[PDB]
Write an enzyme that holds these catalytic residues in place. Structure first.
Site, PDB file in Angstrom:
ATOM      1  N   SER B 341       0.800  -1.241   0.000  1.00  0.00           N
ATOM      2  CA  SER B 341       0.000   0.000   0.000  1.00  0.00           C
ATOM      3  C   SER B 341       0.831   1.289   0.000  1.00  0.00           C
ATOM      4  CB  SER B 341      -0.937   0.025   1.182  1.00  0.00           C
ATOM      5  OG  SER B 341      -1.602   1.248   1.120  1.00  0.00           O
ATOM      6  N   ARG B 342       1.139   1.768  -1.181  1.00  0.00           N
ATOM      7  CA  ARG B 342       2.024   2.902  -1.378  1.00  0.00           C
ATOM      8  C   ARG B 342       1.661   4.138  -0.581  1.00  0.00           C
ATOM      9  NH1 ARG B 342       1.930   0.429  -6.122  1.00  0.00           N
ATOM     10  NH2 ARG B 342       3.819   0.065  -7.387  1.00  0.00           N
TER      11      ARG B 342
END
Ligand SMILES: CC(C)C[C@@H]1NC(=O)[C@H](C)N(C)C(=O)CNC(=O)/C(=C/c2ccccc2)N(C)C1=O
Lengths: 467, 477
Positions: B341-342
């Site tokens: 999850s950037r």
């Protein structure tokens, strides 16, 4: 001049001029009508063929939706000209050089063709300076030749961007010169981010006192294909000014240059040519080559380009990234499995070179160790497939030593980032040459054979690995 | 009139070659005699290449065509929120027409770099495995990957469900899904009142291919109407794989040069656009946002495949789901090990960060020794602690479909195991522990639950007050 659109097949225009007027190849045209009630002119293309029959073909830089046949096109009379100079710093640019940062127009002194014949053979140089980054894997196993070009390779999601950010932090915010970042085919976030981040550090204009040392040109993913095939060239035309006009030493940060090829891939078959290796164009080597040899250092100054390159399906045999390599004085090939291990920056200490790994340019202590490090990193790598099934019980006391030390190396080869403080959860650390050099020399000597592995994982200096 | 009308040259495979119509625009809608709608793309020299939007069985070589003059517009409003909509925005549920006041385009440029802001606004999905280790924030694009039958749609079914009223508007786009299966869903969404705020932009398999393209585009435009209105959206596009396929089919029928897996040369501008038009607009536009969760099916867990390759490189994170880790108890199957999850924990509160961040470090260490457990002939306790605290949290991470947990319910639960309560217990039992404990707290202790959320964090009190809760509660097993 004045011709009429003749065929609109996606982002490709077949324009028909009079038998006299012939927009020279690469000469940008511009088209008159487009979107929903209202007349813009954003529709600018670039001649790419003289089909013949009084008819050039051309790729648009903007979306053709809504265009019509017969619409007057116009031969500007030369190639697509971006405005360059000091008045481009602190601003976000279009592939056409139009300001995209809502800060008023751009008050530049003169434009400039993104189409410039690279430096001659006698405008080059051989000086090889180092470029301390601050990561325990670069400056030690593959240094950065100033003027030279860095190739930061990897597959989908491996830390390439995080890698281009830490560099702006460790080198750009502190670089004593001008810098430019091109947005070749990537996410917008990363743009918004790198902007609102470069603002806080005031690398941009906190006030219009204009003390900025950066020029931004962003053509992201969404743009049609005839945009990421050339924003890499706007960013560079703006960089090819600070290099020779202000005799400055400029940096060229291209977040993925592949999205530049992929983008050309897409106008290849479209323009009617015959595809080549892996669906790419026959003109793949002619396209990313003519635009990596302008991005060089000359006697007039310098360009230290730190460029990233996408590696489709994890494969380096792939023609798109493979091609790059030649054009590189260094390489930082990242791994997905060495990243699946949590060790970041996920950089393969074996597959990652740098022309300047010469003792004639850095030293013996930097020269041996690097190799000594790698040597053990070759051993364990050729021991894996063996021990994985053949265990350790019969391994010699001189080979089980390769294992521990290695696992101490591949980990001491980890280092959180000042930008990645949200993926690591620990404070970044600046580890230069000497700090790194010796740190490892204390490992290859089995001076630390007692200490565990995770003692060097995500650690700053060797001491921090012993605390 | 070779200017605003034309003859039909040929109709082969849902595409028609129109003759005349000089005035057409690229992207303009044309209308056939038998009233069949189609878009224009090949403005070729003397003929127009039109892609039909329906059974072309109707078009006949000689019939004429009018140029609607409109560049594919779609109606939009509030009039939807509860209508399984078609692809050209007309009902397919039988409840009448839709009161459209305005009407936005299917394809429109996406928010630039000034019109945007980083993601800080959370997005609760009711999945302990998602909202604690895979943080999806509003405006952020989060991909859902998995083979056939991989509980992906389910991750989605629960999420849209898990949206508190007035909180987030949702659009459910099905591309190439089955009628029935779409229905089994459009019902399981009503029975929980969740269809009072979600649209079902869907186009079945039978539906002509020149539509499964726009399935998402519509589904995205319909949502962009709420974004520019300071509202927040969540878009689920059930398979972008089935949409990519429908793309390939049109290029080849338009006779356009192909490439890898016969995929055209603009297959990356199918996702690098749906997924870009989704974002968190600046507060100088409305703070409105749109979170898209696109699904991309795989083949044999083959991630490196073109479409799945491309999309992953367009999204800000993935939620890999595995075909080997199903029955193994892991239900739902989240490969949190590769699922990223950037945005970061930035999409979570503090109350979650305190637990989740910690749960991160845990279900990250076990991953390194996991394969040892089955072959653990004589490991050390320093490892046992891990192969113990390991398969514990997992069973918390396991979840029954259709039951999305609140955020409180989310944090309190992680708290039990993460803090050594479920420790010395038996895995083949922990599932019922939470189920039992949760309702137990919701009934007897809903006083603390409301303390949790509002304060948004666990005070030194409620902690001790949770401690007395769980310790004595485990003692009721
Ligand atoms: C679906 C319509 C409403 C939007 C299209 N526009 C685009 O997708 C791209 C992004 N744009 C703006 C273009 O100008 C190029 N158009 C197409 O490739 C296309 C391609 C297309 C392919 C197959 C069937 C139909 C169309 N256009 C249709 C444009 O008019």
């Amino acid at each position: 001049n004045l011709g009429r659109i003749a065929q609109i097949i996606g982002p490709v225009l077949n324009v028909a001029f009079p038998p006299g007027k012939m927009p020279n190849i690469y000469n940008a045209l511009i088209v008159k009508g487009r979107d929903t009630a209202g007349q813009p002119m954003n529709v600018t293309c670039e001649v790419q063929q003289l089909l013949g029959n009084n008819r050039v073909r051309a790729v648009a830089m903007s979306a053709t939706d809504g265009l019509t046949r017969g619409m007057e096109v116009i031969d500007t009379g030369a190639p697509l000209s971006v405005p360059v100079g000091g008045p481009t710093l602190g601003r976000i640019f279009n592939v056409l050089g139009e300001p995209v940062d809502n800060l008023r127009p751009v008050d530049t002194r003169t434009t400039s063709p993104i189409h410039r014949s690279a430096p001659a053979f006698t405008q080059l140089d051989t000086k090889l300076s180092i470029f301390e980054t601050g990561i325990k894997v670069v400056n030690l196993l593959a240094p950065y030749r100033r003027g030279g070009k860095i190739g930061l390779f990897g597959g989908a999601g491996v830390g390439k961007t995080v890698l281009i950010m830490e560099l702006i932090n460790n080198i750009a915010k502190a670089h004593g010169g001008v810098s430019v970042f091109g947005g070749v085919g990537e996410r917008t976030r990363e743009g918004n981010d790198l902007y609102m981040e470069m603002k806080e550090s005031g690398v941009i204009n906190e006030q219009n006192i204009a003390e900025s040392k950066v020029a931004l040109v962003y053509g992201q993913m969404n743009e049609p294909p005839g945009a990421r095939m050339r924003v890499g060239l706007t960013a560079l035309t703006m960089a090819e000014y600070f290099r020779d006009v202000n005799e400055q030493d400029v940096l060229l940060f291209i977040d993925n240059i592949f999205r530049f090829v992929q983008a050309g891939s897409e106008v290849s078959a479209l323009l009617g040519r015959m595809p080549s290796a892996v669906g790419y164009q026959p003109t793949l080597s002619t396209e990313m080559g003519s635009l990596q040899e302008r991005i060089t250092s000359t006697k007039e100054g310098s360009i230290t380009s730190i460029q990233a390159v996408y590696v489709p399906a994890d494969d380096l045999t792939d023609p798109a990234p493979a091609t790059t390599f030649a054009h590189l004085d260094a390489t930082t090939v990242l791994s997905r499995g060495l990243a699946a291990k949590g060790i970041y920056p996920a950089v393969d200490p074996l597959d990652s070179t740098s022309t300047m790994l010469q003792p004639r340019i850095v030293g013996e202590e930097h020269y041996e160790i690097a190799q000594r490090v790698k040597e053990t990193l070759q051993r364990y790598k050729e021991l894996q497939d063996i021990i994985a099934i053949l265990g350790l019980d019969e391994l010699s006391e001189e080979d089980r030593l390769t294992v521990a030390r290695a696992r101490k190396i591949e980990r001491f080869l980890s280092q959180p980032f000042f930008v990645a403080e949200v993926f690591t959860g620990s404070p970044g650390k600046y580890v230069g040459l000497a700090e790194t050099i010796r740190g490892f020399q204390l490992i290859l000597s089995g001076e630390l054979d007692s200490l565990p592995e995770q003692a060097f994982y995500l650690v700053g200096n060797i001491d921090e690995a012993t605390a | 009139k070779v200017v605003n009308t034309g003859t039909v040259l040929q109709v082969g495979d849902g595409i028609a070659r129109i003759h005349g119509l000089d005035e057409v625009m690229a992207g303009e809608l044309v209308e056939f005699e038998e009233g069949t709608i189609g878009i224009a793309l090949n403005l070729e020299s003397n003929n127009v290449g039109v892609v039909l939007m329906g059974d072309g069985l109707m078009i006949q070589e000689g019939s004429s065509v009018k140029a609607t003059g409109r560049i594919a517009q779609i109606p939009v409003s509030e009039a939807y929120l509860g209508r399984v909509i078609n692809a050209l925005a007309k009902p397919i549920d039988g409840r009448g027409e839709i009161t459209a006041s305005e009407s936005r385009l299917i394809e429109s440029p996406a928010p630039g770099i000034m019109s945007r802001r980083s993601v800080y606004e959370p997005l609760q999905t009711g999945l302990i495995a998602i909202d604690a280790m895979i943080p999806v924030g509003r405006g952020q694009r989060e991909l859902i990957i998995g083979d056939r039958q991989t509980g992906k749609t389910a991750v989605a079914t629960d999420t849209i469900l898990n949206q508190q009223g007035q909180n987030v508007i949702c659009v459910y786009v099905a591309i190439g899904q089955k009628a029935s299966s779409v229905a089994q869903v459009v019902t399981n969404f009503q029975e929980r009142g969740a269809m009072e705020y979600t649209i079902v932009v869907a186009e079945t398999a039978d539906s002509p291919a020149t539509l499964q393209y726009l399935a998402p585009y519509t589904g995205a435009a319909l949502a962009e109407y709420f974004m520019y209105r300071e509202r927040h959206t969540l878009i689920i596009y059930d398979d972008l794989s089935k949409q990519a396929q429908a793309y390939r089919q049109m290029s080849l029928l338009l006779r356009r040069p192909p490439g890898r897996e016969a995929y055209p040369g603009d297959v990356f501008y199918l996702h690098s656009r749906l997924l870009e038009r989704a974002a968190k607009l600046s507060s100088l536009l409305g703070e409105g946002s749109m979170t898209a969760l696109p699904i991309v099916e795989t083949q044999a867990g083959d991630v490196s495949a073109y479409i799945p390759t491309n999309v992953i490189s367009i999204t800000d994170g993935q939620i890999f789901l595995s075909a080997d880790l199903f029955n193994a108890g892991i239900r739902p199957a989240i490969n949190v090990g590769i699922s990223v999850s950037r945005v970061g924990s930035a999409a979570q509160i503090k109350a979650m960060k305190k637990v989740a961040g910690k749960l991160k470090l845990e279900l990250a260490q076990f991953a390194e020794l996991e394969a040892f457990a089955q072959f653990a002939s004589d490991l050390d306790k320093a490892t046992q602690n891990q192969l113990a605290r390991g398969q514990r949290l997992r069973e918390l991470l396991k979840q029954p479909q259709s039951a999305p947990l609140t955020v409180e319910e989310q944090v309190m639960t992680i708290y039990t195991g993460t803090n050594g309560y479920l420790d010395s217990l038996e895995l083949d039992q922990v599932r019922k522990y939470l189920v039992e404990l949760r309702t137990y707290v919701k009934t007897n202790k809903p006083e603390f639950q409301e303390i949790i959320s509002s304060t948004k964090t666990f005070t030194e009190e409620a902690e001790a007050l949770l401690k007395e809760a769980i310790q004595e509660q485990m003692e009721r097993f």
